[PDB]
Amino acid sequence: AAAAAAAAA
């Protein structure tokens, strides 16, 4: 979940 958020940013 955290990794996905970083990619979006």
Added chain:
Amino acid sequence: AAAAAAAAAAAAAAAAAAAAAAA
């Protein structure tokens, strides 16, 4: 304590994912 913190972090990540889906 560390474990608890980790859990909290995990929880926060899940909430963020839900918000993205709604958008």
Added chain:
Amino acid sequence: AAAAAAAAAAAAA
């Protein structure tokens, strides 16, 4: 407890 905390956080936001 975690759930409660999360809820609180949400409220704060």
